[PDB]
Amino acid sequence: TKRIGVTVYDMSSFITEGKEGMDTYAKANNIELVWNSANNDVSTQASQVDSLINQGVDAIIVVPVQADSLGPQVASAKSKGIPLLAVNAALETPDLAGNVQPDDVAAGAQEMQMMADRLGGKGNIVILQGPLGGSGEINRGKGIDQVLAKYPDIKVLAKDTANWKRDEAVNKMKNWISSFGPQIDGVVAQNDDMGLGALQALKEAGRTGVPIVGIDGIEDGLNAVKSGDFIGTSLQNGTVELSAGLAVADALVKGEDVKTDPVYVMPAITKDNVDVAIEHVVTERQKFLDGLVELTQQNLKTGDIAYEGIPGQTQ
Ligand SMILES: OC[C@@H](O)[C@H](O)[C@@H](O)CO
Ligand SMILES: [Cl-]
Ligand SMILES: [Cl-]
Ligand SMILES: [Cl-]
Ligand SMILES: [Cl-]
Ligand SMILES: [Cl-]
Ligand SMILES: [Cl-]
Ligand SMILES: [Cl-]
Ligand SMILES: [Cl-]
Ligand SMILES: [Cl-]
Ligand SMILES: [Cl-]
Ligand SMILES: [Cl-]
Ligand SMILES: [Cl-]
Ligand SMILES: [Cl-]
Ligand SMILES: [Cl-]
Ligand SMILES: [Cl-]
Ligand SMILES: [Cl-]
Ligand SMILES: [Zn+2]
Ligand SMILES: [Zn+2]
Ligand SMILES: [Zn+2]
Ligand SMILES: [Zn+2]
Ligand SMILES: [Zn+2]
Ligand SMILES: [Zn+2]
Ligand SMILES: [Zn+2]
Ligand SMILES: [Zn+2]
Ligand SMILES: [Zn+2]
Ligand SMILES: [Zn+2]
Ligand SMILES: [Zn+2]
């Protein structure tokens, strides 16, 4: 019955894994999802919002390219009574109908504290950032900086974007390896994708056992934690977070009272608990999807939208 449009920045590993979850929720709830991807381009995303408005969809979910963007389109959707939600990354506009977000400051602090722990509070690092001007970089960078403020003996040799992408991270890391070589004691990657690119560059430079930390717990990232290629990651299960987003949108379409601003808090993943994340994200995905609508509805009541039974979460 209901048609809900989705426009995402790009089909990143996080979004790709999460789409299966969103689609599972949609099928169970008589929602037709209209997928669009913006190729990392603000103007393309603006065009996709506008087309969804024109089509007269029941609701619109945006996973934005840039935080300071889409004002006219958000205004337009609100003026026409079409609920528009930001999910996964943030917008600056005051006109959202909902706003379903990770605590990216906390995630950035958590990854940086994993590295400080690994390094014993001393060493030189490099930092790979998400797309500049996206809330992911802005907020993960705040959290990283909060932790760096406590470690005078940790030095950042370089920071730059690799736009969430593995192969851009390979190239950036190759430049830094050329510039700074075995001065690099660790890599702090704002997502798993970029940390995996950094791993590849290090491997090619003959360099083994350099600590790397990531964010997301995508399939390859979890495998890296399990093998010791990564020191850890922070779980951002897209199947859970994106279906939470859709469930808030569905509730708005239905005129239901709902928490419109829930927060996804990413649990720490290490060798201690990685096995359970691997079951849910990698090896028993279909089983996890079969439980997702029920999980989503339960979590919507507590507000704890990240809960999925990972060791360390609230029991
Ligand atoms: O900022 C929005 C992005 O989707 C991030 O949440 C992911 O961690 C990137 O892999
Ligand atoms: Cl993937
Ligand atoms: Cl699917
Ligand atoms: Cl598949
Ligand atoms: Cl599908
Ligand atoms: Cl922390
Ligand atoms: Cl803590
Ligand atoms: Cl710890
Ligand atoms: Cl050092
Ligand atoms: Cl050292
Ligand atoms: Cl920094
Ligand atoms: Cl690749
Ligand atoms: Cl390649
Ligand atoms: Cl690669
Ligand atoms: Cl993956
Ligand atoms: Cl903790
Ligand atoms: Cl599948
Ligand atoms: Zn699949
Ligand atoms: Zn699908
Ligand atoms: Zn916070
Ligand atoms: Zn902690
Ligand atoms: Zn610690
Ligand atoms: Zn050193
Ligand atoms: Zn900084
Ligand atoms: Zn590659
Ligand atoms: Zn190569
Ligand atoms: Zn994946
Ligand atoms: Zn919780």
Determine if residue 163 is labeled as part of a ligand binding site.
no
**Distance from C-alpha of 141 to C-alpha of 271, rounded to nearest angstrom:** 25
**Distance from C-alpha of 243 to C-alpha of 286, rounded to nearest angstrom:** 15
> What sign has the CA pseudo-torsion 308, 287, 63, 257?
negative
Resolution for this experimental structure (Å): 1.4
- Which run of H or E residues covers position 278? helix 274-278
Atom from ligand 1 closest to the CA of residue 236:
8
CATH T-level fold of 103-236+268-283: Rossmann fold (3.40.50)
Q: Are 212 and 115 in contact (CB under 8 A)?
A: no
24 Cα to the center of ligand 5, angstroms: 7
CA-based nearest residue to 127, from 98, 102, 156, 151: 156
> Side by side, which strands form the sheet with 186-189?
154-161, 123-129, 186-189, 212-213
Cα-to-chain-centroid distance, residue 296: 18
Q: Are 195 and 169 in contact (CB under 8 A)?
A: yes
Cβ 129 under 6 angstroms from ligand 1: no
**Distance from C-alpha of 310 to C-alpha of 266, rounded to nearest angstrom:** 10
DSSP string covering 53-95, please?
HHHT-SEEEEE-S-SS--HHHHHHHHHTT--EEEESS----S-
Atom from ligand 1 closest to the CA of residue 131:
1
* DSSP 8-state class, residue 135: H
Q: Where are the domains of the chain?
A: 1-102+237-267+284-315, 103-236+268-283
**Distance from C-alpha of 197 to C-alpha of 79, rounded to nearest angstrom:** 43
Residue with tokens 């379409």, as numbered in its chain? 253
**Distance from C-alpha of 6 to C-alpha of 63, rounded to nearest angstrom:** 8
Tally of residues, the chain: 315
> How big is the CA angle at 25 (ends 22 and 31), to the nearest 5 degrees?
95
Residue with tokens 């007269």, as numbered in its chain? 56
Compute how many other C-beta atoms are within 10 angstroms of the C-beta atom of residue 193. Answer: 28
Six-digit token string for 270: 């290490």
**Distance from C-alpha of 315 to C-alpha of 311, rounded to nearest angstrom:** 9
154 Cα to the center of ligand 9, angstroms: 7
Method: X-ray
Atom from ligand 1 closest to the CA of residue 134:
1
* DSSP 8-state class, residue 283: I
* DSSP 8-state class, residue 267: P
**Distance from C-alpha of 150 to C-alpha of 145, rounded to nearest angstrom:** 9
Atom from ligand 1 closest to the CA of residue 8:
4
The answer to whether domain 1-102+237-267+284-315 and domain 103-236+268-283 are alike in fold is yes
**Distance from C-alpha of 33 to C-alpha of 123, rounded to nearest angstrom:** 47
Residues 6+ apart with CB under 8 A from 10: 37, 38, 39, 40, 164
**Distance from C-alpha of 260 to C-alpha of 282, rounded to nearest angstrom:** 30
CATH T-level fold of 1-102+237-267+284-315: Rossmann fold (3.40.50)
Determine if residue 104 is labeled as part of a ligand binding site.
no
DSSP string covering 136-189, please?
HHHHHHHHHHHHHTT-TTEEEEEEEE-TT-HHHHHHHHHHHHHHHGGG--EEEE
**Distance from C-alpha of 291 to C-alpha of 142, rounded to nearest angstrom:** 35
Cβ 236 under 6 angstroms from ligand 1: yes
Determine if residue 9 is labeled as part of a ligand binding site.
yes
Cβ 123 under 6 angstroms from ligand 1: no
Cβ 139 under 6 angstroms from ligand 1: no
Determine if residue 216 is labeled as part of a ligand binding site.
yes
